[PDB]
């Protein structure tokens, strides 16, 4: 009937008739019955596919692309389009200046990518990725939302597609969208593409350099929770590669605020992102402390209880913030003023796992740099626990990776914290009373330079008291200390020499 | 010079470095530095790598290609 005739008309050599045949078909695809009749005719669908990628009459390309769009709403329509080689033709239409054509084309491809088995490979092979990325400079937000979603589908779990997106400049184009538009669906769809690319070692650096961290940060206070969460996940995946970025003030401020959220995922992500951004960046450390980050992190730790997915990064962030920057001292004091000492010391005990214990020990070492923390840390029972951890870890090294942590790291960390705590006379008495001198002397023989340093260090602090200096000598520390005198490590050499001077000072008067 | 003098110069150097590293000196050491202020000033006319922070790789990719 109509289909056969229309099909023939579309194949007609007289271009004037095809354009007239296209309108009729497009008009028929708008009705249930006739639509199904079209999709069940391989010849009809093939003609439409040919007419579309050949015509030069705007209205013809529009009616054919529009017809395919309508058919793509059905399973049979999707299959027919697929089998008729419609994908390559649709990808070609992505180069059309006519918005009407482009919209029909990208939407049809979107339906194929979402439901038609085999569509993804076909689109990749047809060069659809490069075409889609190039269209990201358009300004129609609904069009961009569909295009970016297509990119998400094509990139998900496909490294090859992620690399093509990168080579096409996808990162900068995607970041630009995040900084330019306010349409929620587009921001969300784009954040999902960025999330997929953020786990790729090649795209990650490119996203960061394009200003991705700052752009994603602009949306962390959006009412849309799906948008906020996707930005947070992406930011966290990217964070380990963003410690050198500038203009992070705004993002840092918002992350600190999010630490007070009741949403566990928001809190966990915010803590994780802050942990990495405070790594070796004094400006970031300064800003985080400036906006009340210490208090917020302490509260986060308090509320988390035994949830290590939260306490671990929060504790690492605190460790970073209480060291090597103009405000470290203030931060060390702040942790105490906000009632954080009791909880920090608590984390040294079970059920805490090794990673968290290691971070906690490192934090305590930094907190001990503040004299006002010496007594309260002692009063929380930190010293016997640090000593117990040290002894067990040392024995383990004498008899490799435990939960991802080497026991040599625990030995070094605990001896290091005891070294700082030993600056206080009352702490020295507790430390010495736990019969630790014999152990410290043995650590002098460690092959690990940093262990030699903190062992000599704690012995040095202990040696400032006459009796302790005598007890250290009684333990045969002289020989191992003498060997450390030619160490390349100034610290090791200085602490060792200091213990020797303090030991031979006491009474050693005349000769004999 | 002599062994005795070498000892003094070495002790002064160690004590000055120890104070610079942030450790307190004993009363007898402070006294020692006064007794040999000459050696001290003589040397006065002659560190980092600590709590370095480590990033956590939170990224976790999907599967295949």
Curated annotation (Swiss-Prot), chain A:
Single Gene Ontology MF annotation: signaling receptor binding
GO biological process: acinar cell differentiation; adherens junction assembly; adherens junction organization; animal organ development; anterior/posterior axis specification; apoptotic signaling pathway; astrocyte-dopaminergic neuron signaling; bone resorption
Residue positions where Phosphotyrosine is found in the record: 181, 183
Residues with PTM Phosphoserine: 41, 96
Maturation and modification: Phosphorylated by NEK2. EGF stimulates tyrosine phosphorylation. Phosphorylation on Ser-41 and Ser-96 by CDK5. Phosphorylation by CDK2 regulates insulin internalization. Ubiquitinated by the SCF(BTRC) E3 ligase complex when phosphorylated by GSK3B, leading to its degradation. Ubiquitinated by a E3 ubiquitin ligase complex containing UBE2D1, SIAH1, CACYBP/SIP, SKP1, APC and TBL1X, leading to its subsequent proteasomal degradation. Ubiquitinated and degraded following interaction with SOX9. Ubiquitinated via 'Lys-11'- and 'Lys-29'-linked ubiquitin chains by UBR5, leading to its stabilization.
GO CC aspect terms: adherens junction; apical junction complex; apical part of cell; apicolateral plasma membrane; basolateral plasma membrane; beta-catenin destruction complex; beta-catenin-ICAT complex; beta-catenin-TCF complex
Keywords: Acetylation, Activator, Cell adhesion, Cell junction, Cell membrane, Cell projection, Cytoplasm, Cytoskeleton, Glycoprotein, Membrane, Neurogenesis, Nucleus, Phosphoprotein, Repeat, S-nitrosylation, Synapse, Transcription, Transcription regulation, Ubl conjugation, Wnt signaling pathway
Record-listed S-nitrosocysteine modification sites: 460
Stretches for region Interaction with BCL9: 6-28
Tissue expression from the record: Expressed in cerebellar granule neurons (at protein level). Expressed in the intestinal epithelium (at protein level). Abundantly expressed in the tooth, skin, lung, kidney, eye and brain with weak expression in the liver and heart.
Phenotype of gene-disrupted mutants: Sympathetic ganglia-specific conditional knockout mice lead to a reduction in sympathetic ganglia size and in progenitor cell number, but does not alter sympathetic innervation of peripheral target organs.
Phosphoprotein keyword on record: yes
Subcellular location: Cytoplasm; Nucleus; Cytoplasm, Cytoskeleton; Cell junction, Adherens junction
Source organism, top-level taxon: Eukaryota
ARM repeat extents: 1-41, 43-84, 85-126, 127-168, 169-210, 211-239, 250-291, 292-334, 339-380, 381-412, 435-477, 478-507
Membership in a protein family: Belongs to the beta-catenin family.
Name of the molecule in the record: Catenin beta-1
Organism: Mus musculus
Swiss-Prot record, chain B:
GO cellular component: beta-catenin destruction complex; beta-catenin-ICAT complex; cytoplasm; cytosol; nucleoplasm; nucleus
Keyword match Cell membrane: no
GO molecular function: armadillo repeat domain binding; beta-catenin binding; transcription coactivator binding; transcription regulator inhibitor activity
Keyword annotations from UniProtKB, A to Z: Cytoplasm, Nucleus, Phosphoprotein, Wnt signaling pathway
Cytoplasm found in the keyword field: yes
Top-level taxon of the source organism: Eukaryota
Compartment(s) where it occurs, according to its Swiss-Prot or TrEMBL record: Cytoplasm; Nucleus
GO biological process: one example: negative regulation of protein binding
Pfam families: ICAT (PF06384)
InterPro entries given in the database record: ICAT_dom, ICAT_sf
Chief subcellular location: cytoplasm
Main function: Prevents the interaction between CTNNB1 and TCF family members, and acts as a negative regulator of the Wnt signaling pathway.
Similarity field: Belongs to the CTNNBIP1 family.
Subunit structure and binding partners: Binds CTNNB1.
Name of the protein in question: Beta-catenin-interacting protein 1
Gene name as annotated: CTNNBIP1
């Amino acid at each position: 009937r109509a289909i056969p005739e229309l099909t023939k008309l579309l194949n007609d050599e007289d271009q004037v008739v095809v354009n007239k045949a296209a309108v009729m078909v497009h008009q028929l695809s708008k009705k249930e019955a006739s639509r199904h009749a079209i999709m069940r005719s391989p010849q009809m669908v093939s003609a439409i596919v040919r007419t579309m990628q050949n015509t030069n009459d705007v209205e013809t390309a529009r009616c054919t692309a529009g017809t395919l769009h309508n058919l793509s709403h059905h399973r049979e329509g999707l299959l027919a389009i697929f089998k008729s080689g419609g994908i390559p033709a649709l990808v070609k239409m992505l180069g059309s200046p006519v918005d009407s054509v482009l919209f029909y084309a990208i939407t049809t491809l979107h339906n194929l990518l979402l439901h038609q088995e085999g569509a993804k490979m076909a689109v990749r092979l047809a060069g659809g990725l490069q075409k889609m990325v190039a269209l990201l400079n358009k300004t129609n937000v609904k069009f961009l939302a569909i295009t970016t979603d297509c990119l998400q589908i094509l990139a998900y779990g496909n490294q090859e597609s992620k690399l093509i997106i990168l080579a096409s400049g996808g990162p900068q184009a995607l970041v630009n969208i995040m900084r330019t538009y306010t349409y929620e669906k587009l921001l969300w769809t784009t954040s999902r593409v960025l999330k997929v690319l953020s786990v790729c070692s090649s795209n990650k650096p490119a996203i960061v350099e394009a200003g991705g961290m700052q752009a994603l940060g602009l949306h962390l206070t959006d009412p849309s929770q799906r948008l906020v969460q996707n930005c947070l996940w992406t930011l966290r995946n990217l964070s380990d590669a963003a410690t050198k970025q500038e203009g992070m003030e705004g993002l840092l401020g918002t992350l600190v605020q999010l630490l007070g959220s009741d949403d566990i995922n928001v809190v966990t992500c915010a803590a994780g992102i802050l942990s990495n951004l405070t790594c070796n960046n004094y400006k970031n450390k300064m800003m985080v402390c400036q906006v009340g980050g210490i208090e917020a992190l302490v509260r986060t730790v308090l509320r988390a209880g035994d949830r290590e997915d939260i306490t671990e990064p929060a504790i690492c962030a605190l460790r970073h913030l209480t060291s090597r920057h103009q405000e470290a001292e203030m931060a060390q004091n702040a942790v105490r003023l906000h009632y954080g000492l009791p909880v920090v010391v608590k984390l040294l005990h079970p059920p805490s796992h090794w990673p968290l214990i290691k971070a906690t020990v490192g934090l305590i070492r930094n907190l001990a740099l503040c004299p006002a923390n010496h007594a309260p840390l002692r009063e929380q029972g930190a010293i016997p626990r640090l000593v117990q951890l040290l002894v067990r870890a040392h024995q383990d090294t004498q008899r490799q990776f435990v939960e991802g942590v080497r026991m040599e790291e625990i030995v070094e960390g605990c001896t290091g914290a005891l070294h700082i705590l030993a600056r206080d006379v009352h702490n020295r008495i507790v430390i010495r009373g736990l019969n630790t001198i014999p152990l410290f002397v043995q650590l002098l023989y460690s092959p690990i330079e940093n262990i030699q340093r903190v062992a000599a260090g704690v012995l040095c602090e202990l040696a400032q008291d006459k009796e302790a200096a005598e007890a250290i000598e009684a333990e045969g520390a002289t020989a191992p200390l003498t060997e450390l005198l030619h160490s390349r490590n100034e610290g090791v050499a200085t602490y060792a020499a200091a213990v020797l001077f303090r030991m031979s000072e006491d009474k050693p008067q005349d000769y004999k | 010079k002599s062994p005795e003098e070498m000892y003094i110069q070495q002790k002064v150097r160690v004590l000055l470095m120890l104070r610079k590293m942030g450790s307190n000196l004993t009363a007898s050491e402070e006294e020692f530095l006064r007794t040999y202020a000459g050696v001290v000033n003589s040397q006065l006319s002659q560190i980092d790598q600590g709590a370095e922070d480590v990033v956590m790789a939170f990224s976790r990719s999907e599967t295949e290609d």
